[PDB]
Write a protein that binds this ligand. Structure first.
Ligand SMILES: Nc1ncnc2c1ncn2[C@@H]1O[C@H](COP(=O)(O)OP(=O)(O)O)[C@@H](O)[C@H]1O
Ligand SMILES: Nc1ncnc2c1ncn2[C@@H]1O[C@H](COP(=O)(O)OP(=O)(O)O)[C@@H](O)[C@H]1O
Ligand SMILES: Nc1ncnc2c1ncn2[C@@H]1O[C@H](COP(=O)(O)OP(=O)(O)O)[C@@H](O)[C@H]1O
Ligand SMILES: [Mg+2]
Ligand SMILES: [Mg+2]
Ligand SMILES: [Mg+2]
Ligand SMILES: [Mg+2]
Lengths: 711, 360, 148, 370, 371
C-alpha cells in the first residue's frame, strides 16, 4: 500500500501539513479514498477509475472495514449491515464542495445496494428511478457559481427502504434547502438554475413560440443579472435532450411536460414585468405583453393576475380588503411569486418522483416492519472572497449539521462508554450551540434580527441591519464587525461586512442584498390567484386549504430555518455515517493537486478536529459473540468452538493475541480496542491464519476427490 | 403556540388576534347587553337586541370595569379560544387618557387574567407601523376618540399631540338627531345600532359642503333609501353629508374645538420648522371614522388651504384604515427589539400597577 | 506413534497401495504418496507430505517403498482434523453466516490461498459441491459429505 | 499609506483631508446633536447622539451643540466624537497610519493645544502631530511669504502680519467676533420683521439665510437710505415648511457688525481698523508690503462687496501714496486647509512634527516647544 | 384734566389708569368673547361681542379670543375693541384729551410698534404717545437705576439688565413662555387625574386653579418623591358646577415648566439660567451689582416659593463670593404699570412723547426714532 489508509494511524496528528501530505501522497497514486476512523475522505479524480465495477461490489460485500483499502463500498456495507442487524434506521451523510463528487458518490451507493441486496429486480427499479430522475433534479436545482459549473443549490435526501428480510421494499426522495433567492437574483459571475438556459438554447422553435420566448437569455431580467448568459464549459443545447429524456423516463406525459415548461417560461415572463407609479405612488403594471402570456401559461385570468401583482388582500370581519402595493413591494410580490412558483414546482417534481418509489405492499398486517437506509447529498461550507445571503444560509446549515454530529456521534460515544461501564475520561470538544443560538435563537439570533429589518417601519437597509447586529449581538464571542473589531483586525474586515467565528473558522459576510433576498412577500392574494389555476401543476402546488393560514408571509431565512429544522429532525431519529468529499482543483483536470484549495477543504470540513477527537477515543468495538466468532481461529483454546461464556472466550483470546492493558477494554457486553494499530495487527494475523483454513479445506477435498471415482 | 396577543380595545369594536397574523381574528362590538344568560357580549348582544345595550368604553376611557372584565373574558375565552396565562398581551390606549385607565388595565391583566407580561401602546403610534413609516402625522379616529400624533424618524412630540373627544359615536348620535327632521325616530339603544349602520352605508364627506347643500336643495339627485329590519323604507338626502361634516365643523354637536383638518394642521404647526415638510407629505389616517367616501379628498383640500403653496400635501388613507392600529400592534409585538419592552409579572410584584407609566 | 497398525489394517493399506504399485516394484512416486493416503481417505496437506518426504528423499530415485509409506500413514493418523473444524473453516469464509457460499466465491478462496486448487480440481469440486445447478454450496452439508 | 492628515477644526465646519490633495475631502459642520424627544418607535436604530451632516439632516428632533466656540474647545467629549467621526466615518482611515496636522487660532488658552495633543497621542494614538496657527496657513495657500492675513471663521477673526516668512507676534490682533456672532445678530435683527428663530435648529436656518442673502455695503449709510426708499434691495427666502420670508436692510446690517462691532455691544474697532492697527504695529519698512498684500480667508470673508469695502476703509486710513490691495481668492473658505496641505507636504516640515516618542519623553507641554 | 394715561397691554390682563395713581384703575382680562350658540329669547339684550369682566362672567355661552399672544397683537380689530373698552367703559375718558403711555416686550416685530401708533393716532386720536419697555418700567417701580429685571406676564418672559440707567441691548433675553403656556400645560397635565378641561372657558377654570393651588418646589425631585409618598401635598378645588377636584404633584409640576421649559417641548434654558446668561452677557464690572438686584415682575412671578427657588438656582451658578439677592415685592403683578406712572409723571419725560404734530410730519416709522 502507499500512505496510511486511516488518518488515526499518523503520529504527527496535531499538524495540518502531515495530513495534507498523506492526502497528496495517496491521491497521486490513484488511492482516492482514505478514512478518519469510521468517517470516509474521498478525493475527486476527475477521470474514470474502474474501481466501481461489479467485481469490486463483490470484493467488498460483507468484508470487514479493516481487511481492505477504503472505498464507498466499505462504508455502504457497514451502514447496510448495521441496518440489517440492529434494525434501526441509518443516514449516510455526504458533504463537501461543489464539484467534489457528492452526486457521483450517491450514484455509486445506489449501484452497490442494487448488486448486493437479495432482490435484484426491485433493487434495479429503485436504483433506475433514483438515477434516471437525476438530470431533472440537476436541471431544476443546480446552478453555475463563481467556482464550479454545476453547484447543487439544495440538499437532496434519498432512501432505499428495507424490510426485516433485508430486501429493498421501495425508496423515498426529498429535497430540503432549495436556494429560493437565486430564481430572481444572482451575484456577478453566477447564473440562474440550469433549466432556463437549457430551455432557451435547447428547445424546439415551436415550443419556444408556444411559450412566447426568444432565444437570447439577456432578454430576461432573471437570467441577465449574472452577466454569464453564455459559457464555454456548459452545452445547454445538449443537456436539454438528456433532461427531456429524463422527464419522459419518470413516466411524465407530454401534457405534464408542457404544463411544466409553461412554468419555466412563466418564471422568465414574471421577471420581465415592469411596474410604474400611479399618482398615489401605487404600482401599476406598465406592459401587457408579459401578462398576455402569463394568462395562458399559468392558466390564471389576466385581470386577476394584474390585480394580485399590484394589491395585497387582508380578510377581517368577513370583509375582504385589497390594499395597493408601493412599487418596491410590487417588485417583491412579483419576485415572491417567481420564488414560490419555482420552489413549489421543484417540490412537486420531487414528490412526483417519490410517489413512484413507494411500497407496493398492503401497509397492513403482517406488515410490521420498516427500516431506512437514508442518504443525504448536502453542500459543504461555502466560502468565497464575497459571501452573501446564500452562503450565510448554507454555512448556517453546516453549523447545524455539525451541532447534530456532536449530538448523534460525539455524545452517543461517551454514553456508549458509560453504558458499557468503561472508566474513561471524556474527550474535550467545542460546542456549536453558542453559534447555532447566535444565528437562530428566537429573539436574539441573526435570522430574527434580519426578519425584523424586513418587517420594521421606515427606510430600513442592509447597512441599518448591520448597525442592529452590532447593537443586539454586541458582547458576543463568535460575532464581529469592522466597528466591534480591534485595529489589528480592521485591516482584514470592511464597513459593508460582519464576521462569524463558525466551528471550522471565520467566514465574512457582505450585507448587500440581505434585505432584498430575505423578503418573500407572497401575499394570500397571489396564493388564491394561483389556487384557481387551469394549469394542472399549479393546482397541485397551490392548495385551497393553505388560504386558512392567517400569518404574514415568512421570509426566506425563516423558511430555510424551518426546513433545516425538518432536515435535522429527519436525521435525528437515525444512526449516522459520514463521507467528506475533496475537490483537488478549482478547474477540474486529473492528477493536479491545489494545496491552497485542499488546505481550505481540510480546514472547513473540520477534518483535523474530527481526527483529534477520534484518535483520543477508542477506535473499535464489537459485542463479544461477534468478536469471538471472527478471531477465535487464532487461539486453539477457542478453536473451532469455545464452550464457556463469549466474554470468557474473548478474555483468553486477547491473552493469546498478547494485547497490553492500554490497548483494549472489556466492557459490559462489548470488547473495545483503543488504537487501530492493535486491530490492524490482529487482522494481519487472521489474514495469514486463513491460509491454514484453506489448506485444511483443500487437503480435505483432495481426501474426497479420489474415493468417488475409483474401485 | 405562545405568540403575543394583540388586543385593540377600541371604544366601539374590540379587535383581537395574535402578533404575526395579517388581520384580527376577533372583531366584535365593545357591547354588553342585559335583558330588558344574565348578559350577552359582542355579536351575541348585537343580534339579540330586542337587550339594554351598554358600552363600557366612552371617549377611549373604561367607564364600567365589571362589563370590561366580561368583554376581556369573552375576547380570550369565547372569541380567541385562548388561555391568557400562556400569552403576553399587547393592549392599546388613546393618548392623554387618565392614569387610572392604564393602571387598572395593568392590574386586571395580571390579577384577573394572570397574563405573563403586558404592554399598553398608544393607538396612533401603532397606526404608523401598519403604514410602514417612521415619519408621519397620524390622524386616528375611532368610535370615541379622534387624535393626532406627529412622529419624526421614530420620535414622538408629546407637546404637538392633539386629542378631540368626538368621533364615530358622536356622529351616530348626531345622525340619530338630524333624522328626526324627516320624521324618522330612533331613541332606543338598539335603534342607535340601526343608525350606526345607516351612517356606515349611506354617509360621505362633501368636497364642498355648501355646493352639496345646494345640490340636495335644488334636486333629489343625492338621495338614497335604506330598508329597516322592521321592513320599512327610510329615504335620506342632505343627511348623508351633514353627518360627517361634523368632523370639519364640530359646532353641529355644539362643541367649541377646531375641525379635524385644523387639529391636524395645528399639530404640524406645533412641530419644529424643519420636520413640517415630511409631516405634510405623510398625513396617515386610521380608525373607522376615517372611512367615509370623499374624506381623504376633503382633508387634502382643507390642508392645502392652510399650508403654504409650495408644499406637496399627501394623505395616506389605506383601504384597511379600519384595522391599521391592530395591524400595527401585530407588527410591534413581533419585533425582536420589543421583547424587552414588556411589563413582566415579576416586575408587577416588586412594584404595583403604577409600573405601567415607567415602562410605557 | 499415537497408535500401532494392526496386520489387517496393514493388509488393507497394502491392497489399496496395489492399485498404484500394479507391476510389483513395491514403490510409489513422492507426490503420489498423497494420492494413496487420499485413496485410504486421509486428509494430508502438501506441506505435511513434503515435511514427511524430506526424511525419505535423502538418496533420490523419485519414489518411496511400502514400509516407509506405511510409516508415513502412521504419522498422519496422529492428529486428524475434526468435522466441526472443517465446517468452521468454511464458516469463516461465509459472508452472510447463513450456511451457503457461491461456486465463484469458493473458486476465489480455493485459488487465492496457499496449497491452491488447480482449475481442474475446482471444476471436479463444483461438479457436486453445487448439488443441482443453482450456483451455491451448502458448506455444512458439503463438509458432512466430504468427511464421509 | 503614511500620508499626513490635515484637519482644520473650525468653530463652524470641520475641514479634513490628506496633505497633497487639492481641497478637503471632509467638509461638515462641527456639531454633535442629541435627541430631545421621546423615542416611541421601538423598531428603528435610534442613536444616543449624531455628528456632522446626519446631525444637520435630523436637526428638527435634535438639540445641536458645537464643542468649539471662539476657536476654543469647550466640550472635549463632543470634540472626541467629532474627531472620531472625522477619521472613522468621513475620511475612513486609522489615525495610527497618519501624522496629523491640526490648526489653532492665535492668542488661545495653552490648555487647548495640550489637551488636543493628549487626545491625539493617548486616544487616537497618532504617530506624530503638529498645531499650526491658522492665518499662517492661509499665506501658503495664497502663494506668498509676505502679507497680512485677515482670517474670519465661525468663532474668531484674527490678523497675522508676516514679512519674508517672519510672523510679527506682538502685532497679532484677535477679535472674538465672526460668523456665529453674525448669525446670532441676524437672529436678533430678523425679529424686527416678525420672523422668530430661537432654537439650535433654527440658528442653522438663519445661518443659511446669512450665507445666501447677505452682502457688505460699499457705504452703509447710503445702502440704509436706499433700502428705506424702495424695495430694490429686498430679497425672498423660502423656509423648510415652505413659508416665504422677505429680507431688506437686514441683508447688510448683519455683515456691518464686522465693521461696527458695537451692533453686538462690543467695545472693539472693526476688521478694517484692526487690520490697519496690526499693520501700524509693524516696522515702517514692512508696512508698504503689508498694505499691498491683505490676504483674506475663512467663510466670514465670503460676502459680496467685502473686499471692495475693506479696500475703501483701509484707503481712508493709509497714506495716500500707498497701493492698498486686498487678496480675496474664490477658495477663501478653504485657504487654511489648502495651506495645511502645502505645509504638511513640504520636505522641510518633516523635522517639525511632534512624534509620539517626544510625547513619551515630555508630557502634553511638548506642544509649546515645537 | 389732561393728565397722562398709562396702559400696560398685557398678554392676559389690561392694566390701565392715570399717571397720578398708585395702582391701575382698571385691571381686567385682555379677552373679547363672541356668543357661540344661537339666541332664542327675543328682547333679551344679548350683544354681538363682550370684553373683559363681562366676557369673563358670560363665558358659558361665548368663545373667548385673546388678541395678544406672546406680546404681539395678532388681531387688530379685537385689540381696538379692548382699547375702546379701556378708555370709554372702564376708565370713563376721551383718549383725544390724554397723552397715552403704552408698553411692549423688547424684541417685538416693528409692525406692532408702528400699528399700535397708527391706531392710537388715527383711531383713538390721542394727543401724544410713547411705547416704553415693560422690564425698563418695572425698575422705576422698584426704586432703582441698576438691576436685572425678570418680567413674566401671561405670554412673554424677558430679562433686561440696566446699570446706572443704561440698558445693555445685547444682553436682553426673550422667552415666549409665561402664564398661558403654564395654563396650557396644566390643562394637559390635569388629564392624568381624568379632568378634561378643553374649551376656551375651561382654560379660565385651569387658570383659576393655577392661581390658587400651584407653587414652585424649592427642590423638585424631593417634592416629587414626597407627593409620590403621601396625600399631604394634595389640595381640593371646587369647580363652578360644585364638583370637587383634587390635585397633588400637578401643583408644583406646572411652575417647574419655567425651570424646565422642556416640559412643553421648548428647547430654551429655564428662567434662572436665562437670568444668569444675561448677567454673563454684561460687562464684568457690572455683574456684582446685577446679582444683588434681580427684580422680579409680572404675574407669572407670583407663585409661592419662586424667589427662594430663583435665589437657590442662581446661587448654584454664580461665583460663591457673590451676594445674590432677589427683589420680589408684594405688588409685583402691577410693577410695570406702577413704573409707567412714575415715567409718565417725570418732568424730564415731557419732551419724549411722540406728539400728533410729529406723527403728521412722519408716519408710523416715527416710533423707532423716539422709542
Ligand atoms: N364604513 C364606515 N364609514 C363610516 N364610519 C365607519 C365606517 N366603518 C366604521 N365606522 C365607524 O367608526 C366606528 C368604529 O371604528 P373603530 O376604528 O373600530 O373605532 P374604535 O377603535 O373605537 O373601536 C363606529 O362608530 C363605526 O360606525
Ligand atoms: N457664502 C457665505 N457668505 C457668508 N458667510 C458664509 C458663507 N459661507 C460660509 N459662511 C459662514 O462662515 C462660517 C464658516 O466659515 P469657516 O471658514 O468654515 O469657519 P470655521 O473655520 O470657523 O469653521 C459660518 O458662520 C458660515 O455661515
Ligand atoms: N397668584 C398668581 N399665581 C400664579 N399666576 C398668576 C397669579 N396671579 C396672576 N397670575 C397669572 O399671571 C398672568 C397675568 O399677569 P400679568 O403680569 O398681568 O401678565 P400680562 O401683562 O401679560 O397680562 C396670567 O397668566 C395669570 O394667570
Ligand atoms: Mg451534485
Ligand atoms: Mg380605535
Ligand atoms: Mg476657521
Ligand atoms: Mg383667560
Amino acid at each position: 500500500r502507499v500512505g496510511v489508509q486511516d488518518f488515526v494511524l499518523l503520529e504527527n496528528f496535531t499538524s495540518e501539513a502531515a495530513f495534507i501530505e498523506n492526502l497528496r501522497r495517496r491521491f497521486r497514486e490513484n488511492l482516492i479514498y482514505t478514512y478518519i476512523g469510521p468517517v470516509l475522505v474521498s478525493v475527486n479524480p476527475y477521470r474514470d477509475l474502474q474501481i466501481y465495477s461489479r467485481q469490486h461490489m463483490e470484493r467488498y460485500r460483507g468484508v470487514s472495514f479493516y481487511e481492505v483499502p477504503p472505498h464507498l463500498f466499505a462504508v455502504a456495507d457497514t451502514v447496510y449491515r448495521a441496518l440489517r442487524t440492529e434494525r434501526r434506521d441509518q443516514a449516510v451523510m455526504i458533504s463537501g464542495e461543489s464539484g467534489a463528487g457528492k452526486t457521483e458518490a450517491t450514484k455509486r451507493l445506489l449501484q452497490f445496494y442494487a448488486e448486493t441486496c437479495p432482490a435484484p429486480e426491485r433493487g434495479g427499479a429503485v436504483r433506475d428511478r433514483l438515477l434516471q430522475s437525476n438530470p431533472v433534479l440537476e436541471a431544476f436545482g443546480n446552478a453555475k457559481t463563481l467556482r464550479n459549473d454545476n453547484s447543487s443549490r439544495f440538499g437532496k435526501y434519498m432512501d432505499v427502504q428495507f424490510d426485516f428480510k433485508g430486501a429493498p421494499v421501495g425508496g423515498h426522495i426529498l429535497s430540503y434547502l432549495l436556494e429560493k433567492s437565486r430564481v430572481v437574483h444572482q451575484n456577478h459571475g453566477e447564473r440562474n438554475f440550469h433549466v432556463f438556459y437549457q430551455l432557451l438554447e435547447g428547445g424546439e422553435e415551436e415550443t419556444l413560440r408556444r411559450l412566447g420566448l426568444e432565444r437570447n437569455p439577456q432578454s430576461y431580467l432573471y437570467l441577465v443579472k449574472g452577466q454569464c448568459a453564455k459559457v464555454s464549459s456548459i452545452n445547454d443545447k445538449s443537456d436539454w435532450k438528456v433532461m427531456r429524456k429524463a422527464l419522459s423516463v419518470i413516466d411524465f406525459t407530454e401534457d405534464e411536460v408542457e404544463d411544466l415548461l409553461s412554468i419555466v417560461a412563466s418564471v422568465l415572463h414574471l421577471g420581465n414585468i415592469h411596474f410604474a407609479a400611479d399618482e398615489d405612488s401605487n404600482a401599476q403594471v406598465t406592459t401587457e405583453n408579459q401578462l398576455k402570456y402569463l394568462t395562458r401559461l399559468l392558466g390564471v385570468e389576466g385581470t386577476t393576475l394584474r390585480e394580485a401583482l399590484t394589491h395585497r388582500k387582508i380578510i377581517a370581519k368577513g370583509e375582504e380588503l385589497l390594499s395597493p402595493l408601493n412599487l418596491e413591494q410590487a417588485a417583491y410580490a412579483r419576485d415572491a411569486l417567481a420564488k414560490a412558483v419555482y420552489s413549489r414546482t421543484f417540490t412537486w417534481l420531487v414528490r412526483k418522483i417519490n410517489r413512484s418509489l413507494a411500497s407496493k405492499d398492503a401497509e397492513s398486517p403482517s406488515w410490521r416492519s420498516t427500516t431506512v437506509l437514508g442518504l443525504l447529498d448536502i453542500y459543504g461550507f461555502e466560502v468565497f472572497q464575497h459571501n452573501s445571503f446564500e452562503q450565510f444560509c448554507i454555512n448556517y446549515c453546516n453549523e447545524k449539521l455539525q451541532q447534530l454530529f456532536i449530538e448523534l456521534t460525539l455524545k452517543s460515544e461517551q454514553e456508549e462508554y458509560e453504558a458499557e461501564g468503561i472508566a474513561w475520561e471524556p474527550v474535550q470538544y467545542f460546542n456549536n450551540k453558542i453559534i447555532c443560538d447566535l444565528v437562530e435563537e428566537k429573539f436574539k439570533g441573526i435570522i430574527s434580527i434580519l426578519d425584523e429589518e424586513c418587517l420594521r417601519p421606515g427606510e430600513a437597509t442592509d447597512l441599518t441591519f448591520l448597525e442592529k447586529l452590532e447593537d443586539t449581538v454586541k458582547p458576543h464571542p463568535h460575532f464581529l464587525t469592522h466597528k466591534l473589531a480591534d485595529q489589528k483586525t480592521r485591516k482584514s474586515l470592511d464597513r459593508g461586512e460582519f464576521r462569524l467565528l463558525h466551528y471550522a473558522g471565520e467566514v465574512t459576510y457582505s450585507v448587500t442584498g440581505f434585505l432584498d433576498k430575505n423578503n418573500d412577500l407572497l401575499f394570500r392574494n397571489l396564493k388564491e390567484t394561483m389556487c384557481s389555476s387551469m394549469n394542472p401543476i399549479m393546482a397541485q402546488c397551490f392548495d385551497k386549504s393553505e388560504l386558512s393560514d392567517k400569518k404574514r408571509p415568512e421570509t426566506v431565512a425563516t423558511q430555510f430555518k424551518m426546513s433545516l429544522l425538518q432536515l435535522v429532525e429527519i436525521l435525528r431519529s437515525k444512526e449516522p455515517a459520514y463521507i467528506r468529499c475533496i475537490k483537488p482543483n478549482d478547474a477540474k483536470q486529473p492528477g493536479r493537486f491545489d494545496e491552497v484549495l485542499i488546505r481550505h477543504q481540510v480546514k472547513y470540513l473540520g477534518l483535523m478536529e474530527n481526527l483529534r477527537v477520534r484518535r483520543a477515543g477508542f477506535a473499535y468495538r464489537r459485542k463479544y459473540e461477534a468478536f469471538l466468532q471472527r478471531y477465535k481461529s487464532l487461539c486453539p483454546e477457542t478453536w473451532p468452538m469455545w464452550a464457556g461464556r463469549p466474554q470468557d472466550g474473548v478474555a483468553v483470546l486477547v491473552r493469546h493475541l498478547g494485547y497490553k492493558p492500554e490497548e483494549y477494554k472489556m466492557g459490559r457486553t462489548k470488547i473495545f480496542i483503543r488504537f487501530p494499530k492493535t486491530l490492524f495487527a490482529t487482522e494481519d494475523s487472521l489474514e495469514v491464519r486463513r491460509q491454514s483454513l484453506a489448506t485444511k479445506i483443500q487437503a480435505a477435498w483432495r481426501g474426497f476427490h479420489w474415493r468417488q471415482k475409483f474401485l | 403556540e405562545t405568540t403575543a396577543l394583540v388586543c385593540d380595545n377600541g371604544s366601539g369594536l374590540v379587535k383581537a388576534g395574535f402578533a404575526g397574523d395579517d388581520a384580527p381574528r376577533a372583531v366584535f362590538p365593545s357591547i354588553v347587553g342585559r335583558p330588558r344568560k344574565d348578559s350577552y357580549v359582542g355579536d351575541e348582544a348585537q343580534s339579540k337586541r330586542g337587550l339594554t345595550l351598554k358600552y363600557p368604553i366612552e371617549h377611549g376611557i373604561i367607564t364600567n370595569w365589571d362589563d370590561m372584565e366580561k368583554i376581556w373574558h369573552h375576547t380570550f375565552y369565547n372569541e380567541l379560544r385562548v388561555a391568557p396565562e400562556e400569552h403576553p398581551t399587547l393592549l392599546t390606549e388613546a393618548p392623554l387618557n387618565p392614569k387610572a385607565n392604564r393602571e387598572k388595565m395593568t392590574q386586571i391583566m395580571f390579577e384577573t387574567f394572570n397574563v405573563p407580561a403586558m404592554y399598553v401602546a398608544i393607538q396612533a403610534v401603532l397606526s404608523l407601523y401598519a403604514s410602514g413609516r417612521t415619519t408621519g402625522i397620524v390622524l386616528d379616529s375611532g368610535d370615541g376618540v379622534t387624535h393626532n400624533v406627529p412622529i419624526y424618524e421614530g420620535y414622538a412630540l408629546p407637546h404637538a399631540i392633539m386629542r378631540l373627544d368626538l368621533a364615530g359615536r358622536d356622529l351616530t348620535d348626531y345622525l340619530m338627531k338630524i333624522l328626526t327632521e324627516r320624521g324618522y325616530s330612533f331613541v332606543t339603544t338598539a335603534e342607535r345600532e340601526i343608525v350606526r349602520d345607516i351612517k356606515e352605508k349611506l354617509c360621505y364627506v362633501a368636497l364642498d359642503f355648501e355646493n352639496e347643500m345646494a345640490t340636495a336643495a335644488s334636486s333629489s339627485s343625492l338621495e338614497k333609501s335604506y330598508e329597516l329590519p322592521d321592513g320599512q323604507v327610510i329615504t335620506i338626502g342632505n343627511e348623508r353629508f351633514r353627518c360627517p361634516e361634523t368632523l370639519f365643523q364640530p359646532s353641529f354637536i355644539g362643541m367649541e374645538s377646531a375641525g379635524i383638518h385644523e387639529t391636524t394642521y395645528n399639530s404640524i404647526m406645533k412641530c419644529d420648522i424643519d420636520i413640517r415638510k415630511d409631516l405634510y407629505a405623510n398625513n396617515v389616517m386610521s380608525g373607522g371614522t376615517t372611512m367615509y367616501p370623499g374624506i381623504a379628498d376633503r382633508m387634502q383640500k382643507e390642508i392645502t388651504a392652510l399650508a403654504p403653496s409650495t408644499m406637496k400635501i399627501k394623505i395616506i388613507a389605506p383601504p384597511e384604515r379600519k384595522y391599521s392600529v391592530w395591524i400595527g400592534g401585530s407588527i410591534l409585538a413581533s419585533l425582536s427589539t420589543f421583547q424587552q419592552m414588556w411589563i413582566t409579572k415579576q416586575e408587577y410584584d416588586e412594584a404595583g400597577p403604577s409600573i405601567v407609566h415607567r415602562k410605557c | 506413534m499415537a497408535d500401532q497398525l494392526t496386520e489387517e489394517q496393514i493388509a488393507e493399506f497394502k491392497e489399496a497401495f496395489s492399485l498404484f504399485d500394479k507391476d510389483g516394484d513395491g514403490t510409489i512416486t513422492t507426490k503420489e504418496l498423497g494420492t494413496v493416503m487420499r485413496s485410504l481417505g486421509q486428509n494430508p496437506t502438501e506441506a505435511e507430505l513434503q515435511d514427511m518426504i524430506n526424511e525419505v528423499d535423502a538418496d533420490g530415485n523419485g519414489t518411496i517403498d511400502f514400509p516407509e509409506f506405511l510409516t508415513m500413514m502412521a504419522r498422519k493418523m496422529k492428529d486428524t482434523d475434526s468435522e466441526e473444524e472443517i465446517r468452521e473453516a468454511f464458516r469463516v469464509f461465509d459472508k452472510d453466516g447463513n450456511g451457503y457460499i457461491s461456486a465463484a466465491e469458493l473458486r476465489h478462496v480455493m485459488t487465492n490461498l496457499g496449497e491452491k486448487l488447480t482449475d481442474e480440481e475446482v471444476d471436479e469440486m463444483i461438479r457436486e459441491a453445487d448439488i443441482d445447478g443453482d450456483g451455491q454450496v451448502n458448506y455444512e452439508e458439503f463438509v458432512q459429505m466430504m468427511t464421509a
